[PDB]
Nucleic acid binder design. Structure first.
Lengths: 431, 28, 61, 652, 445, 48, 279
RNA sequence: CAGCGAAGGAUUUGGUGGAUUACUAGCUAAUAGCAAUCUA
């Protein structure tokens, strides 16, 4: 490499040190409130005292900023210089800055957080040192002047490369620019680690979940025509779906439901992946809107399932788990809705799992398959395992009235399954 | 502009390694 | 006439990592024995055949 | 059979054969010693340059080789050879007849496992000398204790102990007291590989079903398990530069990378080597470095490097995938055709059954390069046909290189298996050319030639018709129709004045070339399989079907010698550059040298593989043969370039 | 804590200051020899400071169902044969040897049909010859070849009866007042149909015919019918062995095309329906197992210049049933037009409405629809136009979405003037105006 | 009759909506302070 | 090129079994070689990518063993039209050659493994593999009566194998290309011929010495020998037939063909001969 | 338009790797040590 390249590397290392007055002015005029001519003449005491006022306002709004008043906004930090302590003190205060940023990511619509993080911008130089976490935290606010301001004063990371024509510009970045930003794979790994820290420290708020889910399903939509990009993309977004389903927020759970339903209708996933996805869906299902989205998600994920094995009995563990999260009244009511969801293959798998695993609730399967209409292969498999139920256990009135329903519609088909296995006079002598 | 997948020029570095010649002892 | 890289016009392709140029200024054939001399920059290069090697028959059976 | 003209020099074009190589570290540099059949080769890992080749061929194939600092330990049939700078320093004969097949070196001890599940320990005499030399004891792994020994390792800080990895068990021996310290519990599937982790007292085991176990050799437990379903695990390596990655190597040719800290899967390099030749056979991280050297049984040795992470704050979670770095390689199948590219004996063109044309260097093995098959654009502007999934050209029957106009236009003309056109190539650019010469009679190309003006190429089809194309502009100039069965040899004068063709109907046609007349036609007594024209003396030799070599001159059109003695079909032959000898090779596993002045056989070599190609250098330096097995090119040097040999006939 | 102690290291005793590497693991300047367990601990700490201790060893040893299934799987889609129905938007279609490459055609290939059972492909065009090719992958050879002088052919069809499936007739016809019928016997016995039994004024050219099956419906005796499209609105149906005019069906307008649907009734009884389209867009369905009487009359939604109707998803005339119990009801019906618009109707619900709406109107190729054929499973429709070059699309259905990866810009489709689907192999033949049948295999089948 | 069972299995398949490049581009306009379940049914309306 | 992918006669040359493709699926048919003593029904391979790699007539319900490319030997009776029994190895490797002696079937694998099956017991008796034989594509049982000792296996290089020791007892210099015919002529000789060359060579199975070389004038596709070594008829790539009459006598080291037969029509079109039979 | 025409074609460009001389290994205080270290 060349000498100017190696010197650009040492400039990028020494970016924040003010080595004379002109660099100090150019480096201290980068404010988030004031313009450059006021910001260059301000002091540390002035910006600290009104940032401490704004942190008291932000702390009486949300009381988790008081420990930042203890450490990051204390009065020892007026004289704390960033690039004079070692790497271990640097990583201490940079996870302090990361904690503040992913706590105050939600508060970015109210001016105390602007005047408070003004002091992180001007004392700790987080627009050029801790800049990836700053962009990732305020990414939701991209139509707003506060994201315009941080783009004007930011030094843009190499992963955020497509925002480089919207820095120091008067127009906001557009939604197609946001999808082009999210369309990378390394950016997707970065954003999923950011969400992992959000989910861990319990700071996921609904505007973030909406923006994140919108950009994720637009990434899947953009890559919907190349299977190798979809296959690069599956263990990233299904991993973040698992980590959103493994939390307590109903909003982040149905965000994961949205990601799972778009991804399963974008490409045909494996049967075992779909079953483990419904196990992870049911294993933390506690809300009601989450239950609504969870039933619709499990129905569509079973609908988008092809081949030999789409409508087996779902196994005993996952069927009794689905029973413990959704009883009979819930399933029957949801099928009785006039909007008519498409629940064909899932309801077939459900009734076959009832016939292999319950053997008491057969009047309810008569009522629900009276409600919704199925296909020929669905009802053929249903009456074949009802035939096997008749041959294993003694045939009472619930199985008899089920066969009366399967005689009252499509009696030629039940004749075809009895002639494929058994006989009609022998079956009438059975029951 | 998309992100820049350019490769750096790779040079090897000086690494320390445990050699196992000290893992053998003689009896008196 | 030369593979010396110390002379100039020898290599057609230079390693991507004045000198005396190479040139022949006079050629002549020998008047008595099947050879030629070439006045290069390195000296008088004398190229000659010899019949000790190269089996080259003339209508043997 | 020992010879008296040609003596063996080297076998070029070979990089690996799928013995797991060893890495070694002098100071802060690394070398890579790979086995090529019966020799090993040491490579400089910073640039993959061939430092050393072992001095003598071992009496059998090297089967397990390791490398400490300056010394390389190569185990073949019975014994362990200790080599420094190629030259062998010591030879340790084992007291068994069992084949030694594993070894480790730690401390003063070299431990070599045979295939009858016995282990031979060798000790240094005084701890200041260089290699273990004296016999110490013998260890035995009987059927009660464990299965077949599948690996033999020494994980660090274990004072004179040895981890023996059997197929089901892990034993731990004290090699001074000869004792079995600890035998682990069994493993429910057969373990194939082992690698010691840079974590203290942890080994990593790789099974024949798809799982990597992380055995803790002091607790006796397993720490964790990594499952890669339906994949047999053939390599394990660990990253040691502050990034805890593991690299497993799968015998369908895959290199999978795992993060052990956050339990994710970083990346998969698919088809890094051929499954049919063994998959990835040895993959190892150069320690402290983000570069991993892989090697496979397909005669290939690659390096992959991890670039630093693209996120400036996260890093550990955004791991950029491994990219390719330098690699060396050769043919993965034995070569089918051989030619010398120039008169200096520097490069030689070489085509194989794996459908690649390499250009191998006889001077420096880094200069060996595969001629590229990336086609040019069509001349008019129309589309070119062919499949979208690009594959290599059919394997090369014949070729003819004539570098009179080299760099100017197309230079090599080559003929492929069962296809009706002959491609061209440019040796200067090292790539294909713009022209494919058709035969124009729906017959496959049986021979090619080209003139030494470089203007004309000659195609000889299987329906007996010579077509003469221009190499610069690629168009048909002339078309001679003499033969009716397949034309197997075309050549032309050094003055472009008389051409000579030979077909497998057994007629040699003599044509004038400037005028398009024929000068004559001579009917031999067998179908002719191959012609070689010695161009200065104007004498061409024919390999007839009656197992003779007819030497005939083109000036007066007479059979002037007829050489008898081969017992089976003559595969190849070639003239001496002075045109005094002709060396032939045939399917009776023999190579003969004929002094065509006196007309008799000077020397004979019985060689175990049948030599399919024989070429002299255009100076009298080297003979290059090519055999049925072996991916390389065997190289001989004629001792008659330094002494004078007697032209007195051998027999038997 | 430890699973073994060896009792030899405790009584070993090492030196330290003899080599420079072990010279660093002393704790004093008076230590010269140390015990073995001490020495092992010294170089254990030294190993730990050469290679620092990671977090994966001491961190953990071995709702997570999704994470576990992702950490074990490597492929994430359905594998090979547990699909059974086509994936949309990306085909899987290899190119084989061009079928008539062995023996070239001297004209544009006007019609093209596979055999119902044997591996035979019949091509035929305006050079008044018809050729049969044994097709396979590699070497599509020519079985036989018959040149009818003075009779250019426009439609040629393999007919194979349902009773014994042993006739194997070839019916062929062009712009003539006759139609030939070759009886396949492996000389060649062909007969000529040239009598409309009183109806010659309404049938002046035998070009557009189709062959179908008909049941007597008082016996269970089937026989083949040929159906000729005539001038006014007329379809003249006549026997395929005796040539007797059986019945005729007249639609009101300019008859442009027609197709044959079958529907089963009971064991061994089916019913034949003729579906004929006006130029304007109104469609008649005639029951013709009885007298040729109309049972339904509906109208195509949109569509003003209508060139070609086709059914599919069951037994068409191009996917024919070999056995009478294997006759299926067609699911799909595509009406393709002069603007390139192809309406697509789903006859599992669009037999009742009498102004039925299409499930989709395809618009991808912009000139006149001259072929549209359904694959035998009824999952692909093939739109094709003989007007511009390379105008062929394969639209997946039920999703009604065109495959976007084939044909590409480098497919040698030519000016597509005929197309045919194999009944068993999953295999397209596409004949163009240069005289070339190109051949492709769909790897789903 | 396994061919008849396979034909009825491929016959019982219903028309679905496929994801395009631009099936979800018009959601950024109304992800502003709506609830996440309203986002879920707005997505499900696009998918159906 | 020919549509007939595989073809073989029964012993005595009365029926011909032949595998051809039929619109992407293999089909196996049997024709009588003289009608004076059509057969329109085939065995159909139901998979598009399952194909026959070798076939052998058994000798008495008459049957064919068809070695497939999924580690199976199908056993298919020809009067009926079903595969009567499906031998399988433990693997998915395609099998390169089979043979039988009496009731004892032997077969070679693409992983260079030897399998032995018993036609009387329908069981896998033995499975092994031997060193330095690694590209095998032909085996031939050297006959010694009901003893099935001495296999003869080719990989471009013929090797004689004792099966009691599972080891190689002789090594013949083969060819420069894979061996395509490998057949035992007498109790002391075997002929071999490779892919894409026109040279057969007859080796002495007791010494290793090549007795003679037989030279076709085109690349050899198949060969047949009469049952008493007195004549060998090979059929070549250009559709011709070449008869070597009495090749095992003293044209001393290499012998040309004695007779050459080709077929033309009444037109001038030359049809190709594939797979003749001599007696 | 014709023609060429295998699940696409063309043009332009950034980065890296290998060759561009003929392959005997790293370091040092060098007849040897080290390479985990030269220092008591």
């Amino acid at each position: 490499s060349s000498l100017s390249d190696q010197l650009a590397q040492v400039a990028s290392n020494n970016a924040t040190v003010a080595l004379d007055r002109k660099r100090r002015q150019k480096l201290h005029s980068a404010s988030l409130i004031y313009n450059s001519k006021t910001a260059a003449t301000q002091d540390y005491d002035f910006i600290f005292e009104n940032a401490s006022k704004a942190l008291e306002e932000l702390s009486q709004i949300e009381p988790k900023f008081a420990i930042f008043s203890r450490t990051l906004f204390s009065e020892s930090s007026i004289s704390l210089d960033r690039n004079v302590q070692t790497k271990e003190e640097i990583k201490d205060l940079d996870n302090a800055i990361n904690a503040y940023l992913l706590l105050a990511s939600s508060k970015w619509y109210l001016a105390p957080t602007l005047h408070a993080t003004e002091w992180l911008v001007r004392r700790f130089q987080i627009h050029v040192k801790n800049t990836e976490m700053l962009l990732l935290s305020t990414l939701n606010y991209y139509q707003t002047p506060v994201f315009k301001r941080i783009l004007s004063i930011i030094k843009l990371p190499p992963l955020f490369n497509c925002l480089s024509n919207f820095v120091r510009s008067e127009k906001p970045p557009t939604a197609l620019t946001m999808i082009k930003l999210f369309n990378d794979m390394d950016f997707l790994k970065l954003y999923t680690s950011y969400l992992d820290q959000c989910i861990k420290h319990n700071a996921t708020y609904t505007n973030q979940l909406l923006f994140t889910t919108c950009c994720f399903i637009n990434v899947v939509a953009f890559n919907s025509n190349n299977d190798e990009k979809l296959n690069q993309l599956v263990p990233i977004l299904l991993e973040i779906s698992a980590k959103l389903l493994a939390s307590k927020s109903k909003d982040c759970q149905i965000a994961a439901h949205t990601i799972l339903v778009v991804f399963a209708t974008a490409l045909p996933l494996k049967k075992t992946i779909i079953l483990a996805a419904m196990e992870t869906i049911l294993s933390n299902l506690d809300a009601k809107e989450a239950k609504h989205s969870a039933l619709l998600t499990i129905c569509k994920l079973f609908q988008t399932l092809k081949g030999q094995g789409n409508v087996d009995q779902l196994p005993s563990k996952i069927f009794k788990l689905f029973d413990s999260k959704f009883d009979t009244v819930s399933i029957l009511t949801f099928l009785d809705k006039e909007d008519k969801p498409v629940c064909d293959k899932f309801i077939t798998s459900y009734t076959r799992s009832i016939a292999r695993y319950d053997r008491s609730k057969l009047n309810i399967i008569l009522s629900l398959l009276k409600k919704i209409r199925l296909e020929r292969y669905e009802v053929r498999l249903i009456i074949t395992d009802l035939i096997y139920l008749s041959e294993i256990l003694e045939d009472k009135s619930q199985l008899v009235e089920l066969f009366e329903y399967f005689i009252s519609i499509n009696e030629d088909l039940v004749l075809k399954c009895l002639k494929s296995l058994g006989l009609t006079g022998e079956l009438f002598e059975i029951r | 502009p998309k992100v820049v997948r350019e490769a750096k020029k790779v040079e090897m570095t000086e690494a320390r390694a445990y050699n196992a010649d000290a893992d053998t002892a003689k009896a008196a | 006439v030369s593979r010396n890289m110390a002379l100039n016009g020898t290599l057609e392709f230079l390693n991507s990592k004045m000198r005396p140029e190479v040139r022949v200024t006079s050629v002549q054939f020998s008047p008595t024995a099947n050879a030629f001399a070439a006045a290069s920059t390195e000296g008088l290069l004398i190229y000659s055949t010899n019949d000790t090697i190269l089996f080259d028959p003339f209508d043997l059976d | 059979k020992n010879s008296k003209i040609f003596s063996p020099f080297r076998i070029i074009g070979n990089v690996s054969n799928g013995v797991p190589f060893a890495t070694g570290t002098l100071g802060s540099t690394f070398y890579i010693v790979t086995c090529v059949g019966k020799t090993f080769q040491i490579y400089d890992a910073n640039t993959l340059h061939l430092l050393f080749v072992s001095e003598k061929e071992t009496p059998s194939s090297i089967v397990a080789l390791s490398a400490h600092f300056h010394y390389v330990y190569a185990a073949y049939e019975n014994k362990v050879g200790i080599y420094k700078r190629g030259i062998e320093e010591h030879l340790l004969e084992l007291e068994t007849d069992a084949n030694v097949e594993h070894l480790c070196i730690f401390g003063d001890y070299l431990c070599a496992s045979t295939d009858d599940n016995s282990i031979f320990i060798y000790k240094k005499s005084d701890p200041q000398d260089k290699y273990p030399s004296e016999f110490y004891t013998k260890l035995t792994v009987t059927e009660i204790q464990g299965g077949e020994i599948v690996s033999l390792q020494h994980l660090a800080t274990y004072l004179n102990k040895l981890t023996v990895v059997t197929k089901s068990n892990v034993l731990l021996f004290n090699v001074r007291t000869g004792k079995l310290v600890f035998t682990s519990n069994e493993f429910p599937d057969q373990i194939t590989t082992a690698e010691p982790a840079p974590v203290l007292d942890i080994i990593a085991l790789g099974t024949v079903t798809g799982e990597v176990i992380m055995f803790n050799m002091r607790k006796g437990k397993r720490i964790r398990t990594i499952k890669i379903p339906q994949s047999r695990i053939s390599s394990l390596s660990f990253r040691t530069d502050g990034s805890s990655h593991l690299s497993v190597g799968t015998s369908s040719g895959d290199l999978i990378f795992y993060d052990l800290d956050r339990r994710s899967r970083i990346h998969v390099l698919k088809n890094i080597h051929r499954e049919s030749y063994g998959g990835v056979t040895q993959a190892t991280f150069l320690n402290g470095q983000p570069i991993i050297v892989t090697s496979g049984g397909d005669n290939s040795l690659k390096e992959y490097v991890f670039d630093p992470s693209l996120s400036q704050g996260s890093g550990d979670v955004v791991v950029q995938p491994p990219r390719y770095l330098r690699s060396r390689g050769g043919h993965s199948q034995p070569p089918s055709y051989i030619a010398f590219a120039d008169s200096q004996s520097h490069f030689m063109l070489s085509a194989s059954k794996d459908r690649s044309l390499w250009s191998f260097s006889l001077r420096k093995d880094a200069q060996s390069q595969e001629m590229s098959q990336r086609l040019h654009k069509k001349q008019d502007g129309g589309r070119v046909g062919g499949s979208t999934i690009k594959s290599k050209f059919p394997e090369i029957v014949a070729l003819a290189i004539e570098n009179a106009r080299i760099g100017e236009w197309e230079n090599i003309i080559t003929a492929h298996k069962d296809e009706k056109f002959a491609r061209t190539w440019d040796m200067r650019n090292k790539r294909v050319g713009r022209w494919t010469f058709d035969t124009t009679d729906d017959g496959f190309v049986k021979s090619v030639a080209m003139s030494q003006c470089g203007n004309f190429g000659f195609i000889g089809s299987s329906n007996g018709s010579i077509t003469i194309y221009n190499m610069q502009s690629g168009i048909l100039r002339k078309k001679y129709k003499l033969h009716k069965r397949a034309v197997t040899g075309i050549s032309l004068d050094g003055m472009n004045r008389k051409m000579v063709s030979c077909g497998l109907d057994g007629i040699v046609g003599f044509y004038d070339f400037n005028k398009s007349t024929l000068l004559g036609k001579l009917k031999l007594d067998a179908p002719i399989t191959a012609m070689v024209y010695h161009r200065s003396s104007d004498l061409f030799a024919l390999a007839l079907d009656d197992l003779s070599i007819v030497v005939i001159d083109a000036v007066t059109q007479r059979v002037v010698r007829q050489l008898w003695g081969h017992s089976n079909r003559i595969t190849a032959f070639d003239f001496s550059p002075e045109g005094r000898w002709i060396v032939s090779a045939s399917l009776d596993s023999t190579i003969r040298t004929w002094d065509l002045p006196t007309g008799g056989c000077i020397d004979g070599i019985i060689v175990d593989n049948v030599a399919t190609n024989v070429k002299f250098s255009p100076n009298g330096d080297l003979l290059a043969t090519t055999h049925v097995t072996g991916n390389g090119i065997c190289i001989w040097t004629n001792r008659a370039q330094f002494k004078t040999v007697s032209t007195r006939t051998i027999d038997e | 804590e430890a699973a073994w102690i060896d009792s030899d290291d405790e009584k070993i005793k090492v030196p330290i200051l003899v080599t420079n590497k072990t010279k660093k693991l002393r704790t004093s300047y008076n230590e010269s020899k140390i015990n073995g367990v001490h020495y092992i601990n010294r170089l254990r700490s030294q190993f730990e400071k050469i290679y620092p201790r990671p977090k994966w060893v001491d961190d953990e040893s071995d709702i997570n169902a999704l994470t576990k299934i992702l950490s074990t799987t490597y492929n994430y889609k359905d594998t090979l044969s547990n699909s059974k129905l086509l994936p949309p938007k990306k085909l899987d279609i290899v190119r084989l040897k061009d079928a008539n490459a062995s023996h070239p055609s001297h004209s544009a290939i006007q019609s093209l049909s596979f055999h119902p059972s044997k591996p035979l492909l019949l091509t035929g065009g305006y050079d008044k010859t018809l050729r049969i090719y044994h097709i396979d992958g590699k070497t599509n050879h020519l079985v036989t070849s018959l040149h009818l002088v003075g009779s250019p052919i426009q439609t040629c069809t393999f007919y194979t009866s349902l009773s014994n499936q042993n006739q194997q007739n070839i019916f062929t016809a062009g712009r003539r007042r006759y139609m030939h019928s070759w009886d396949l016997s492996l000389t060649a016995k062909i007969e000529k149909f040239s009598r409309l039994y009183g109806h010659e004024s309404t049938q002046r050219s035998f070009e557009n015919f189709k062959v179908a099956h008909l049941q007597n419906s008082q016996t269970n005796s089937v026989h083949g019918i040929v159906l000729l499209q005539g001038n006014n609105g007329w379809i003249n149906i006549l026997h395929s062995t005796s040539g007797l005019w059986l019945m005729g069906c007249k639609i009101e307008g300019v008859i442009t095309d027609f197709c044959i649907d079958y529907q089963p009734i009971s064991r061994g009884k089916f019913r034949t329906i003729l579906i004929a389209v006006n130029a304007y867009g109104e469609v008649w369905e005639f029951d013709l197992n009885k007298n040729g009487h109309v049972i339904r009359r509906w109208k195509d939604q949109g569509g003003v210049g209508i060139t070609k109707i086709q059914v599919g998803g069951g037994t068409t005339t191009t996917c024919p049933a070999l056995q009478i119990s294997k006759i299926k009801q067609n699911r799909w019906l595509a009406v393709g037009s002069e603007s390139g618009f192809v309406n697509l109707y789903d006859r599992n619900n669009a037999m009742t409405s009498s102004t039925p709406t299409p499930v989709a109107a395809l618009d991808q190729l912009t000139t006149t629809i001259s072929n549209l054929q359904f694959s035998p499973d009824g999952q692909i429709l093939c739109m094709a136009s003989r007007a511009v070059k390379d105008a062929l699309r394969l639209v997946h259905l039920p999703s009604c979405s065109v495959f976007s990866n084939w044909p590409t810009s480098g497919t040698p489709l030519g000016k597509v003037t005929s197309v045919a689907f194999s009944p068993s192999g999953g295999l397209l033949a596409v004949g163009n105006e240069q005289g070339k049948v190109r051949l492709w295999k769909l790897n789903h089948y | 009759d396994e061919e008849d069972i396979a034909l009825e299995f491929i016959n019982g398949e219903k028309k679905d909506k496929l994801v395009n490049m631009n099936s979800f581009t018009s959601m950024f306009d109304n992800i502003q302070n709506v609830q996440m379940d309203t986002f879920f049914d707005r997505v499900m309306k696009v998918l159906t | 090129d020919s549509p007939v992918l595989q073809s073989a006669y029964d012993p005595s040359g009365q029926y011909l079994c032949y595998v051809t493709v039929a619109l992407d699926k293999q089909r196996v048919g049997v024709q009588p070689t003289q009608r004076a003593t059509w057969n329109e029904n085939f065995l159909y391979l139901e998979d598009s990518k399952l194909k026959v790699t070798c076939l052998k007539w058994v000798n008495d319900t008459v049957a064919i063993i068809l070695g497939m490319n999924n580690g199976e030997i199908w056993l298919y009776s020809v009067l009926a039209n079903e595969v009567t029994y499906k031998f399988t190895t433990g693997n998915s490797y395609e099998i390169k050659d089979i043979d039988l002696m009496g009731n004892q079937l032997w077969c070679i694998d693409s992983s260079d493994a030897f399998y032995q099956f018993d036609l009387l017991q329908f069981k896998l008796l033995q499975h092994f593999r031997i060193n330095n034989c690694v590209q095998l594509n032909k085996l031939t049982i050297v006959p010694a009566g009901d003893s099935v000792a001495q296999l003869l296996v080719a990989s471009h290089s013929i090797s004689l194998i004792d099966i009691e020791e599972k080891k190689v007892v002789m090594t013949f210099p083969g060819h420069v290309s894979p061996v395509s015919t490998l057949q035992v002529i007498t109790n002391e000789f075997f002929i071999s011929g490779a892919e894409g060359d026109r040279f057969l060579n007859v080796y002495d199975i007791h010494s290793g010495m090549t007795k003679c070389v037989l030279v076709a004038e085109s690349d050899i596709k198949e060969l047949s020998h009469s049952g008493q070594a007195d004549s060998i008829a090979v059929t070549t790539e250009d559709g011709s037939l070449e008869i070597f009459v009495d090749p095992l006598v003293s044209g001393n080291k290499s012998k040309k063909s004695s007779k050459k037969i080709q077929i033309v029509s009444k037109d001038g079109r030359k049809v190709p001969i594939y797979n003749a039979f001599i007696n």
